[PDB]
Amino acid sequence: NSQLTLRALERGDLRFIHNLNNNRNIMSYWFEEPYESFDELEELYNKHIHDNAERRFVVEDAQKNLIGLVELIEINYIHRSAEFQIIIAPEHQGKGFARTLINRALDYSFTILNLHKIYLHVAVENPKAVHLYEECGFVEEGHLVEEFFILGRYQDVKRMYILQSKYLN
Amino acid sequence: NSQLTLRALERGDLRFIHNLNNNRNIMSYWFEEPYESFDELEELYNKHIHDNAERRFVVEDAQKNLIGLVELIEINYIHRSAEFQIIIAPEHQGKGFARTLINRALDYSFTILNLHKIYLHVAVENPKAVHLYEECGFVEEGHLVEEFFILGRYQDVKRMYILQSKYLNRSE
Amino acid sequence: NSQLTLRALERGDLRFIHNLNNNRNIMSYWFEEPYESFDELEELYNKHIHDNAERRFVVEDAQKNLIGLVELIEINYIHRSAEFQIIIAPEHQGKGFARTLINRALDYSFTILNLHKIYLHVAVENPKAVHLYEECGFVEEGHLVEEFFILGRYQDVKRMYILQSKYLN
Amino acid sequence: NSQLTLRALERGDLRFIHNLNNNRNIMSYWFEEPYESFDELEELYNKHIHDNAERRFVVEDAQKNLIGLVELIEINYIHRSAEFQIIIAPEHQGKGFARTLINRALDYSFTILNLHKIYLHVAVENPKAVHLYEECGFVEEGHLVEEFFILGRYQDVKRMYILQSKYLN
Amino acid sequence: NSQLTLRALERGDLRFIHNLNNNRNIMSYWFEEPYESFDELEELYNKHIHDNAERRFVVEDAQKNLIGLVELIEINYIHRSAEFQIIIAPEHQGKGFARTLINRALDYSFTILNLHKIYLHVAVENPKAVHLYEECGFVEEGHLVEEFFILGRYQDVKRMYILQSKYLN
Amino acid sequence: NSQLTLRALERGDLRFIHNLNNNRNIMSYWFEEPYESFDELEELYNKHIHDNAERRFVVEDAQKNLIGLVELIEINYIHRSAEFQIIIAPEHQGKGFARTLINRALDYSFTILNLHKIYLHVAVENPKAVHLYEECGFVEEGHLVEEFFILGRYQDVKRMYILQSKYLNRSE
Amino acid sequence: NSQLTLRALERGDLRFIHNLNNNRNIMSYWFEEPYESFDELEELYNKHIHDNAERRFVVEDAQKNLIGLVELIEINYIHRSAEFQIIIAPEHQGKGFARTLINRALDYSFTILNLHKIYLHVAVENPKAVHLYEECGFVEEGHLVEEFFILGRYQDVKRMYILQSKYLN
Amino acid sequence: NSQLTLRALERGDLRFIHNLNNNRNIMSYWFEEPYESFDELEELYNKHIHDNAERRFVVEDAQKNLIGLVELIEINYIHRSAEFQIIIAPEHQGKGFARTLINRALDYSFTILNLHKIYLHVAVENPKAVHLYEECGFVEEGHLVEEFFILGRYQDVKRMYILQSKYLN
Amino acid sequence: NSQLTLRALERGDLRFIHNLNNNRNIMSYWFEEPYESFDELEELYNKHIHDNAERRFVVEDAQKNLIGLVELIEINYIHRSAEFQIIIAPEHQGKGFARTLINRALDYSFTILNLHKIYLHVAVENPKAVHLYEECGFVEEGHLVEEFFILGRYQDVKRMYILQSKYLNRSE
Amino acid sequence: NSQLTLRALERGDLRFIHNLNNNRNIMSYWFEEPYESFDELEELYNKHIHDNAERRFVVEDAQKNLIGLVELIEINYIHRSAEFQIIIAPEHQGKGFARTLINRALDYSFTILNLHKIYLHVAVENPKAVHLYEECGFVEEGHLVEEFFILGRYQDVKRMYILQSKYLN
Amino acid sequence: NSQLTLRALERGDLRFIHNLNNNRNIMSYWFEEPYESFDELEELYNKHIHDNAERRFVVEDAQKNLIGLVELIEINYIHRSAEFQIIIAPEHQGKGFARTLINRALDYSFTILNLHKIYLHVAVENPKAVHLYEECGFVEEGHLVEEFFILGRYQDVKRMYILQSKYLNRSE
Amino acid sequence: NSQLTLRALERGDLRFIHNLNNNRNIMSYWFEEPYESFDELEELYNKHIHDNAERRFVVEDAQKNLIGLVELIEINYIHRSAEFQIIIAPEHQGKGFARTLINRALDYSFTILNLHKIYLHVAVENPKAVHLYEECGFVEEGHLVEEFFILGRYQDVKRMYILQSKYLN
C-alpha cells in the first residue's frame, strides 16, 4: 500500500482507461462529453489536454502494475470544490488499496490544488462503499433520488463530502 | 399571469440577462464559463449558440416587458435531468409571477424535452424561496455543506427536485 | 387557390418559419438539428444552405401574404423518396388552401425533382388530417406505435404515401 | 452464444465493415452519406467520430473472431427512438447467433442509452427474417410500399418495433 | 436590335438571373451545382466568381432594360469547345432579339475566346427554335433520346453545333 | 470472365490508373481537372474523395491482377444519367473481357444507382469499338463533328446510349 | 463617495483607459503585452476578452462621470493571489475617492473571487501613497531595488500586501 | 534517340531538376518564383502542383538514365502560346539528343495541348544553339537587347518561334 | 500637361479601370489572371494588393478627372526589367497627354524603382502608336509573328524597348 | 513649441502618413515592406499592429493640426538601438519646430523605451540637416558611400548617432 | 565543474524537465500555464517555442549527463529584469554544482541578454538555499508573507536580487 | 581553395549552423528573429523558407566537409544592397580559406543577384579581420560607436563596403 504511486495521466494510459470502462456498464464521459470507443476517447483527450476542469492520476505499484484511477472533475477554483471518483481494476479490488488511494486523492486536492471541498456520489444500493467513505472521513449531505440511469433503472446515490479543514487537522 | 409568455432567448435579450446578473453578487457563468461584462457574455453566446447542454427562455407580458429568465443547465439526455433556475427582474419580483414561471419551466422540461428529473439549488439562508419551490412540488434531497462562497463566507444550499411522473400524473 | 404560388425559401422568410413553429408542441428541427430561437435557426440556415437533403418552399398569395410552408426532408436520390410536411399559418388555416398546397408540393416533387415516392406522418389523434391526405391521393402504409412524445405522452402516427406513377396519371 | 461480446466500433474494424457491405445489393451509408470504397469509409469515420446520431458495435467470440455488426442509426434523444440493423458475416450466418446479437443490441439500447423504442426495416421477400424478429419480440407496425429500389425493382419492407417497457419486463 | 449590348454578369444581376429561372420550370445549375433560392445562387456566385469554365453576359438595350442572358458553360480550352444558351425575358421574346444575341454570343466565342466549336441543346418538341438556330448557321449533330427530365417526362433534344471557320468566313 | 470482380477504386489503385492513362495520348481528367503526373492525380483523388459526381471501379481476376477500369462521370441525379468509359490494360485487351465489364457497369448503374440513361463517346475512326458497344445494347444518338482534338486534328465521335427500361426488361 | 459604483470594463471604456495612460508616462501593458496606441489596445482587448488572469472595473459616480479604474492582474487561483492597482482620473485625484475605491477592490477580491492575498507596488518616492495604503490595511513586505525604469531612472517600489483574513474581520 | 521517352515531372525528379540548375549559373524560377535550395523548390512544387501555366517532362532513355528536361512556361490558352526550353544533362550534351527532344516537345505542344505558337530565347552569344533551332524549324522574330543579366553582364537573346501549321505539315 | 499628376492606384479607381478595359476588345488580365466583370476585378485586386510583380498608377488633372492608366507588369528585380502599357480614356485621347504619361512612367521606373530596361508591345497594325513610342525613345527589338489573337485573327506586334542609361544620360 | 504634443500613431493617421510620403523621392516602407498606395499602407498597418520592431508617433499642436511624424525603426532590445527619422509637413517646415520634435523623440526613446543609442541617416547633399542634427547632439559616425539610389543616381549619406548617457545628462 | 556546459533547451530534454518537476510538490508552470503530465508539457512547449518571455537551459557534463535546469521567466525588456530559478537533479545535488550554474546563468543574463536585474524567490523555510544565493551576490529585497500555498499551508518566501553593475564591475 | 564549393543552405545544414553559432558571444538571429535552440532555428527556417530578404550558403570542400557559412542579410532590391557575414568552423579557421569564401560570396552577389553594394560590420577589437577585408577590396565607410553589447560592454565596429563596379573590373 505504501508502495502505491499517483502519476498524472498520459496518452499511453488511455487504453487502461478504456478497459476500466467496459466493466462498469454505465455511460462514460470525458470532460462531460460521452464516449464508447477508444478512438473517441483519444480524440477527446487531444481536445481537452489543457483544460483544467478535470484531472486524472494513474495509480501504480512498485512493479508498475496498473492498480486504478483517481479522478477529479467539475473543478471550480472560485468555490474551490471538485467531484472525486476512484476506479480500481477488478483484479485489485479486494486487496484493500482503496483507503490509500482515497487519502492520496484528498492529499493532492487539499495540499496542492488548495481546494476547500471534495464530494462524491455513491450508489445507495452499494452500502459497503458508503461505509468505506464514511470511515475515511466523508459525511452524507444528500440522498439524490433517481439521479442516474444504471442498467435499466433509475438509482439513488449518496452525495458525501469532506472539507479541507477536517482533513488537514 | 396567463398573459405571460415564455420565449426562447435571442441575442437581443443579452442586455436583459446582463442587468439581471449584476444584482446576483455571485459569479455568473455561461455554459460553465465565467463572465462579468456584457462583451464577454455576447462573445460566449456566439460560441455556444448551438450547444444543447443549456437552454434559456425569457418571459414577457402582453406589452413585451422583460419580466424574468428561465434557465436550464447541465442537461443530460442519458440520465434525462437538468438544473433549473429562475431570475425575476427586481421591478417585477413582488407580483406573484414566480409560480407561473416555475410551472411553465416544468411543463417545457417534462412535455417537450421529455426529461425525467428537474433539480435546483436554493440558499439555505433564503427560507421563503425554499418554501416557494416546495409549494410547486419540489422536495429536498440534499443539504449541501459549504457548497458556495457567498458574500465572504461558505454557505449551505438545499438541493430540491421533482420528477416527471409526479408533475404529469399527480392529479390523475 | 389558383393564385397561390410556391417560392423557394429565402433568409428573409426565416422569421415566418420561426412564428409557424412557435405553437407546434414538438421540438423543431433544421436538417435534423434541434433549435428554438430565431438566431439558432438563422445560423443553421447558413450552415445547410447548399445541403440538398431537404428543400423548403413558402406559399404566398397574389398580394404576397405568406400562407404556409411546404417541407421536403430525408430526400434520398438513390431510392427517390422524401418525407413531406405542410404547415399553414393559423390565420389562413380555415380558408381551404391545404389541397392546393399539397398538390403544389407533389407537382414539384414529381415533375422537377423526379422523385418516386412521397410519404408523410400524421397524428392518429388528428383524423380530419388523415381523411384530407387520403382524399388527396395518400394511402396508409403504417401505424407507428408510440413514435413521438407529444403533450406529455407517446402517441401513434399514420405513415401515408403516394407514388409518382399514380399522381402523374 | 454466452461468449459473444459486444464492442464499440474502432477504426481497425473498418475493414471488417467494408467486407460486410461488399455483398449487400444496396448502397451503403455512413451517417446518411453514401460510400463504396474503403478510403471513403475511413474519412467518413473520421468526420463523424463524435456524432452521436449513430452508434455501432462489432460482435466477437471468445477467441475474438468477428461475427457481425450491430447498428443503431437515426437516434433521437427527445423521442428516444432508433433504427436497428444486424449484419452477420456469411461464414457465421448459419450458426444461430442472430438472437443473441439482437438481444445484446436491445440490452444496450434499453439499459445504457435509456431509449424508448427500437424499430427496424426488413424486406417483405425475406419472410424468415420477419419471423425471426417476430420471435425475438418485434411486432409489425407498417408495410412500406416500394420503399427501396433493390435488384432493379422497388420492393416493400416491413417496419417492426419493440418498446423498452416490453423488453425490460 | 443594333442598340443591344452584352455586359459581363455582376452580382447585382443575380436577381435578374433568379427571375428568369422561375419561368423555366426546370432545375437550374450554377457551375454544375443545383440551386433554387436566390441565396443559394449568391453563395455559389461568390464561390465560383473566378472559375473560367462558364461565362455569362447580360443583354441590355439603350435604356438599360434587361433583355436577356447569354451563357457559355463546359468551356474546354484544349478542345476549344463550349455549350451555349440564350434566355430572353418573357416580355421580350417576340420582338426578334434572338438572332442578334446569338450572333453576339458567337462573336465573343470565336473572336475573343478563340474557341473552335459552339454547341447547344434544343428540345425537339420546340421545332421553331430548332429552325431558328438552323437559320443562324447551326447544324444538327445529334438527337439525344430522353436526355433531360422536364415537367414529368423524359424529353429528347437536338444537339446542334457551329464551327469557328464557318462563322468567321 | 465470371472470375472477374468489380471493386470500388482505392488510393492504392492510382498507379494502375496512371499507367492506363499514359497510353491514351489524349488529355486525362479527374473530376474535370487536367492531370499528367501521378502526384497531380493523387492530390486530385484526395480532393474529390467524397464527390459523388463520378464513380470508378477497378476489375480484378481471381489472382487480383488489375485488368481494367470502369468509369462513370457527369452523374446527374435529377436527370438520372451518366457518361461511361471502359479502359482495359494493354496486356489484357484481346482476352474478351470487354463485354463482361460493360454489363457489370450497366448492372451497377441501373440496379444500385437506379440511373435512367447511360451514354458514351467513341471515336468515329474506331469502328470495332462502335460495333462492340452496339452488340452490348448501345444505340447511336449523335455524330459529334470535330468534338475532340486528337493526334493533331479534330475528329468526330459517336455518342451512343442505352436506357434502364431496355437493359432490365428486354428479355421479359 | 457612497455613490461610486464599480462596473466591469467594456469595449466602450477602452478610450477612457487610453486617456488614463497618456498622463502616466510609463509603458502600459494589457495581459503582459505592451501597447501605446488605442488600436493596439482594442486588438489586445479582443484577443484576451475571456482570459481570467486579469480583471478590470470602471469606477463611476451617480452622474456616470468616469472617476477611475480598478485593476487586478497576475491572478493565480491556486495560491489565490493577485496584484492590485488604482488609477484615478487627474480631475478627481484630490477629492478623496481613493480609500473608497481601494475598499471596493478588496471587497470584490475577498468576497467574490475568494482570493487570499492582494499585493501592490508603490513608488518609494511617493511616500504619501505608501501611507495611504498603510492606513487602508496594507503592510510593507518588500523594498524592490531598481525594479522599474520610469522617466529615465531605475526606481525602487514598496511591495505591500493585505490578507483575506484581516479584511473580513 | 528513338528510345528516348518523355515523362511528366514527379516530386521524385526535383533532385534531378536541382542538379541541372547548379551548372547553369543563372537564377532559377518555378512558376515565376525564384529559388536556389532544393527545399525551396519542393515547397514551390507542392504549391503549384495543379497550376497549368507550366508543364515539365523528364527525358529518359531505355535504361531510365536521366537525359534532360523539357519545359513549357507562360502557357496562355486564349492566344495559345507558350515558351519552351530544353536542358540536357552535361554528360549527354554532345551525343545529339537535342533535335529529338525538341521534336518531342513540339509534338506534345501541337498535337495534345493544341497550341498555336511556341517560342524560345537563345543567347546571341551561343550562335551554334541558334543555328540548331533554325534547322529544327524555328525562325528569329526578335533580338532582345540586354534582356537578361547573366554572369555579371546584360546579354542579348534571340527570340525564335514556330507555328503549329508549319510543324503539322 | 504639367497639371497632370501620377498617383498610385486605389480600390476606388477600379471602376475607372473596368471602364477602360471594356473598350479594349482583348482579354484583360490582373496579375496574369483573366477577368471580365467588375466583381472579378475587385476580388483579384484584394488578392494581389501586396504583390510587387505589377504596379499601376492613375493620372489625374488639377480637377481630379481620371485621364488614363500607367501599367507596369512582369517586374523582375534580378534582370531589372518590366513591361509598360498606357491606356488613355477615350474622352481624353486627342489632347496630347500620351507623351507626358510615358515620360512620367519612365521616370518612375528608372529613378525610384531603379529598373534597367522597359519594354512594351504595340500592334503592328497601329503605326501611329509605334511612331509615338519611337518619338519617346523606344526602339524596335522584335516583330512577334502571330503573337495575339485579336478580332478573329492572329496579329503581329512590335516589341520596343528603352534602357535606363539612355533615358537618364542622353542629354549629358 | 511647448504646445507640440507626441501621440502614438492611429489608423486614422494613415492618410496623413500617405500624404507625407507622396513627395519624398524614395520608396516608402512599412516594417521593411514597400508600398505606394493608401490601401497597401492600411493592410500593412493591420498586419504589423503588434510588431514592436518599429514605433511611430504623430506630432500635433494645441489645436491638433498635424505637423509631422517621428519614426523609430530597426529597434533592437538586446543592443538597445534604433534608427530615427523625422518628417515635417511642407506647410510647417519653416516654422522652426524640428528641434522640439527631435528632442521629443529622444525623450521617449531614452526615458520610456530605455534605449541606449539612437542613430539616423541624412543625405550628404542636405548640409543644413546635417548641421541641425549636429546642433541637437548628434555626431557623425559614418559616411556611407552610394548607399541609396535617389533621383537617378547613388548618393552618400551621413550616419549620425547619440547615446542615452549624453542626452540624459 | 568547468566541464559543465550550458545548452539551450530542446524538445528532447522535456522528459528531463518532467522528471525534475515531479519532485517539486508544487504546481509547475510553462509560460504561466499549469501542467502535470508529460503530454501537456510537450504541447505547451510547441505552443511557446518562439515566445521570448522565458528562456531555459539544461546543463550537461562532459559525458552529456543531464545535471540540472536554468530557468529565466518574466523577462521584461523595458525594465530589463527576469526571474531566475535553478533545479539540480536529485542524483547531482550534493556535488557542488549550484554555484557554477548560478554564475553561468548570471553571465548569460548580464552579458548576452544585457539585462539589468535578476531576482529570485526562495522558501523562507529553506535557509541553506538563502545562504547559497547570498554567497553568490544576491541580496534580500523582500519577505513575502504567505505568498505560496505549499504542502498544506501558506508559506513565506524571500525575494532576492542582484544587479548587472555589481556582477560585472565588483572586482574592478 | 579552388575545390571550395558554394551551396545554397538546406534544412539538413541547420545542425551545422547551430554549432557555428554556439560560440559567438552575441545573440543569433534568423530573419531578424532571435533564437538559441536548434528547434527554434528549424521552425524559423520553415517560416522564412521563401523570404528573399536573406540568402545563405554553406561552403564545402571536394570531400564535402563543411567549412563555413556565407550570409547575405538586409537585402534591398531597390537600392541593391546587402550586408555580408562569413563564419568559418573553428577546425578550418587557420587553413587560409577566408579570402576564397569572401570572393565566392562577392561573385554570387555581383554576378547572379546583380547587387550594387556589399557592406559588413567587423569589431574594432579584431584588427586582423579589418586588415583582411581591406586586403580583399573593402574600404572603411564608418566607425559605429557602441553599436553592439559584446562580452558585457558596448563596442565599436567598422562598417566596410565594396561596390559591384570595383569587383567586376
DSSP codes, A57-77: EEEE-TT--EEEEEEEEEEET
The A residues from 107 to 126 touching K (CB cutoff 8 Å) are: 110-114
Please list the residues that pair with A85 across neighbouring strands: A71
CA distance F4 to chain D (A): 15
CB E156 within 8 A of CB E144: yes
SS3 (DSSP) at C65:
coil
- Start-end of H helices in I23-154: 38-47, 98-111, 127-135
Active-site option among C35, C133, C154, C167: C133
Dihedral over alpha carbons C106, C108, C110, C115 (to 10 degrees): -110
Cα–Cα distance measured from residue D168 to residue F32, given in angstroms and rounded to the nearest whole number? 56
* In chain L, domain spans: 1-169
CA K23, distance to chain mean position in Å, is 15
Cα–Cα distance measured from residue L114 to residue L79, given in angstroms and rounded to the nearest whole number? 11
Cα–Cα distance measured from residue I42 to residue I12, given in angstroms and rounded to the nearest whole number? 10
CB D124 within 8 A of CB D157: yes
Nearest CB among A10, A110, A114 relative to K37 is that of A10
Nearest Cα residue to H68 out of H82, H57, H55, H53: H57
Cβ separation of H38 and L111 shorter than 8 Å? no
Cα–Cα distance measured from residue E136 to residue E103, given in angstroms and rounded to the nearest whole number? 8
What is the amino acid identity at position D101?
L
Alpha-carbon torsion (B100, B102, B108, B114), positive or negative: negative
Beta strands in A13-134 (DSSP E): 28-30, 33-35, 55-60, 66-76, 81-88, 117-123
Cα–Cα distance measured from residue L37 to residue L17, given in angstroms and rounded to the nearest whole number? 11
Chains adjacent to H (≥3 CB pairs closer than 8 angstroms): E, F, I, L
Cα–Cα distance measured from residue E9 to residue E18, given in angstroms and rounded to the nearest whole number? 13
Alpha-carbon torsion (I94, I95, I99, I102), positive or negative: negative
Cα–Cα distance measured from residue H86 to residue H101, given in angstroms and rounded to the nearest whole number? 8
Resolution in A: 2.4
Nearest CB among I79, I145, I161 relative to H145 is that of I161
Question: What distances in angstroms separate CA B157 from CA A158, B75, B129, C42, L29, one per listed residue?
Answer: 16, 20, 11, 39, 60
- E114: nearest CA in chain H? H78
Per-residue DSSP letters for J51-110? -TT-EEEEEE-TT--EEEEEEEEEEETTTTEEEEEEEE-GGGSTTS-HHHHHHHHHHHHH
CB F27 within 8 A of CB H52: no
CB J38 within 8 A of CB J72: no
Cα–Cα distance measured from residue H132 to residue H155, given in angstroms and rounded to the nearest whole number? 20
Residue positions of A annotated with a catalytic role: 133
Cα–Cα distance measured from residue D54 to residue C104, given in angstroms and rounded to the nearest whole number? 34
And the C-alpha cell for H65? Answer: 538514365
Cα–Cα distance measured from residue J17 to residue J58, given in angstroms and rounded to the nearest whole number? 9
How wide is the angle at C-alpha B41 spanned by C-alphas B37 and B43, nearest 5°?
Answer: 120
**HSE, side-chain direction, 13 A CA sphere, residue C140:** 15
Nearest CB among I27, I34, I43 relative to E49 is that of I43
**At least 3 CB pairs under 8 A between chains B and D:** yes
SS3 (DSSP) at B113:
coil
And the C-alpha cell for K120? Answer: 529570485
CB F139 within 8 A of CB F159: no
Cα–Cα distance measured from residue D117 to residue D84, given in angstroms and rounded to the nearest whole number? 10
- Is E133 an annotated catalytic residue? yes
Question: What distances in angstroms separate CA E165 from CA B10, E115, F146, one per listed residue?
Answer: 64, 10, 12
Nearest Cα residue to A139 out of A103, A166, A116: A166
Cβ of C31: how many Cβ atoms within 10 Å? Answer: 12
Cα–Cα distance measured from residue K87 to residue K69, given in angstroms and rounded to the nearest whole number? 5
Cα–Cα distance measured from residue I100 to residue I136, given in angstroms and rounded to the nearest whole number? 10
Nearest CB among L53, L148, L161 relative to J79 is that of L148
**At least 3 CB pairs under 8 A between chains C and K:** no
Nearest Cα residue to I9 out of I27, I25, I31: I31
And the C-alpha cell for D64? Answer: 475474438
Residue positions of L annotated with a catalytic role: 133
L85 is in an annotated binding site: yes
Regarding beta strands J5-8 and J55-60, do their DSSP bridges make them parallel or antiparallel, or are they unpaired? antiparallel
Residue positions of B annotated with a catalytic role: 133
Question: What distances in angstroms separate CA I9 from CA D5, I71, J29, J47, K116, one per listed residue?
Answer: 72, 10, 17, 20, 49
The B residues from 4 to 63 touching G (CB cutoff 8 Å) are: 25-27, 33-34, 36-40, 43-44
K110 is in an annotated binding site: no
CB A166 within 8 A of CB A110: no
Cα–Cα distance measured from residue B65 to residue I7, given in angstroms and rounded to the nearest whole number? 57
Alpha-carbon torsion (G41, G46, G48, G49), positive or negative: positive
Nearest CB among A39, A44, A149 relative to D114 is that of A149
CB F132 within 8 A of CB F99: yes
Instruction: Please give the backbone phi and psi of residue B46, each rounded to the nearest 5 degrees, phi first.
Output: -60, -30
Active-site option among G35, G133, G154, G167: G133
Nearest CB among B50, B111, B114 relative to C40 is that of B50
Mutate to test the interface with C, among E23, E31, E39 (most CBs of C within 10 A): E39
CA distance J58 to chain G (A): 11
Nearest Cα residue to A108 out of A3, A8, A2: A8
**HSE, side-chain direction, 13 A CA sphere, residue D50:** 11
Nearest CB among L25, L34, L38 relative to K10 is that of L38
SS3 (DSSP) at A109:
helix
I117 is in an annotated binding site: no
And the C-alpha cell for D154? Answer: 422497388
- Residues with Cβ within 8 Å of B131's Cβ and at least 6 positions away in sequence, in order, are none
SS3 (DSSP) at F148:
strand
Cα–Cα distance measured from residue I63 to residue H22, given in angstroms and rounded to the nearest whole number? 56
Cα–Cα distance measured from residue G116 to residue G167, given in angstroms and rounded to the nearest whole number? 10
Cβ contacts of C27 on chain B, cutoff 8 Å: 112-113
- Residues with Cβ within 8 Å of L42's Cβ and at least 6 positions away in sequence, in order, are L11, L14
Cα–Cα distance measured from residue L25 to residue L148, given in angstroms and rounded to the nearest whole number? 11
Alpha-carbon torsion (K11, K12, K15, K21), positive or negative: negative
Burial of residue A48 (number of CB atoms within 10 Å: 0-12, 13-18, 19+): middle
**At least 3 CB pairs under 8 A between chains H and D:** no
CA distance C30 to chain B (A): 12
What is the amino acid identity at position D38?
F
Cα–Cα distance measured from residue H25 to residue H39, given in angstroms and rounded to the nearest whole number? 18
Cα–Cα distance measured from residue D140 to residue D160, given in angstroms and rounded to the nearest whole number? 4
CA distance C40 to chain E (A): 18
Cα–Cα distance measured from residue D104 to residue D82, given in angstroms and rounded to the nearest whole number? 15
And the C-alpha cell for B43? Answer: 462573445
**Chain pair K-L, CB pairs under 8 angstroms:** 29
Cβ contacts of J161 on chain L, cutoff 8 Å: 144-145
Cβ contacts of K41 on chain A, cutoff 8 Å: none
Cα–Cα distance measured from residue J158 to residue J161, given in angstroms and rounded to the nearest whole number? 10
- Residues with Cβ within 8 Å of B171's Cβ and at least 6 positions away in sequence, in order, are none
CB J98 within 8 A of CB J128: no
Mutate to test the interface with I, among J23, J29, J37 (most CBs of I within 10 A): J37
Alpha-carbon torsion (I121, I124, I128, I133), positive or negative: positive
CB A112 within 8 A of CB A77: no
Q: What is the C-alpha R_g of chain L?
A: 16
Element (H, E) at F127: helix F127-135
Cα–Cα distance measured from residue H22 to residue L57, given in angstroms and rounded to the nearest whole number? 13
Cα–Cα distance measured from residue E163 to residue C63, given in angstroms and rounded to the nearest whole number? 49
Mutate to test the interface with H, among E114, E115, E117 (most CBs of H within 10 A): E114
Regarding beta strands J117-123 and J81-88, do their DSSP bridges make them parallel or antiparallel, or are they unpaired? parallel
- Start-end of H helices in C21-94: 38-47
Asked if the C-beta of L166 comes within 8 angstroms of chain J's C-beta atoms, the answer is no
Cβ of L125: how many Cβ atoms within 10 Å? Answer: 12
Q: Integer distance in angstroms from the first to the last C-alpha of chain J?
A: 22
CB F144 within 8 A of CB F159: yes
Q: Integer distance in angstroms from the first to the last C-alpha of chain L?
A: 22
And the C-alpha cell for A143? Answer: 440522498
| Largest separation between any pair of C-alpha atoms in chain G | 44
CB J123 within 8 A of CB J129: yes
Cβ separation of E78 and H77 shorter than 8 Å? yes
Question: What distances in angstroms separate CA J141 from CA F2, J79, J125, L154, L158, one per listed residue?
Answer: 91, 17, 17, 15, 10
- Residues with Cβ within 8 Å of K72's Cβ and at least 6 positions away in sequence, in order, are K54, K55, K56, K82, K83, K84, K105, K109
CA distance I156 to chain H (A): 10
Instruction: Please give the backbone phi and psi of residue D117, each rounded to the nearest 5 degrees, phi first.
Output: -140, 140
- G113: nearest CA in chain A? A78
How wide is the angle at C-alpha I82 spanned by C-alphas I76 and I84, nearest 5°?
Answer: 160
Cβ contacts of C77 on chain F, cutoff 8 Å: 77
Query: Scanning the structure block, which residue is given the C-alpha cell 503588434?
Result: J50
F92 is in an annotated binding site: no
The C residues from 66 to 105 touching F (CB cutoff 8 Å) are: 77-80
CB F142 within 8 A of CB F158: yes
Cβ contacts of I151 on chain E, cutoff 8 Å: 111
Active-site option among J35, J108, J119, J133: J133
Cα–Cα distance measured from residue H108 to residue H118, given in angstroms and rounded to the nearest whole number? 11
Per-residue DSSP letters for J26-58? S-EEETTEEE-SHHHHHHHHHHTSS-TT-EEEE
Residue positions of I annotated with a catalytic role: 133
Cβ separation of I141 and H142 shorter than 8 Å? yes
The size of chain L, in residues, is 169
Cα–Cα distance measured from residue A152 to residue D107, given in angstroms and rounded to the nearest whole number? 9
Cβ separation of C50 and E43 shorter than 8 Å? yes
What is the amino acid identity at position K141?
E
Cβ contacts of I6 on chain J, cutoff 8 Å: none
CB A80 within 8 A of CB G114: yes
And the C-alpha cell for D15? Answer: 475493414
Cβ separation of L37 and K168 shorter than 8 Å? no
SS3 (DSSP) at D159:
strand
CB D68 within 8 A of CB D59: yes
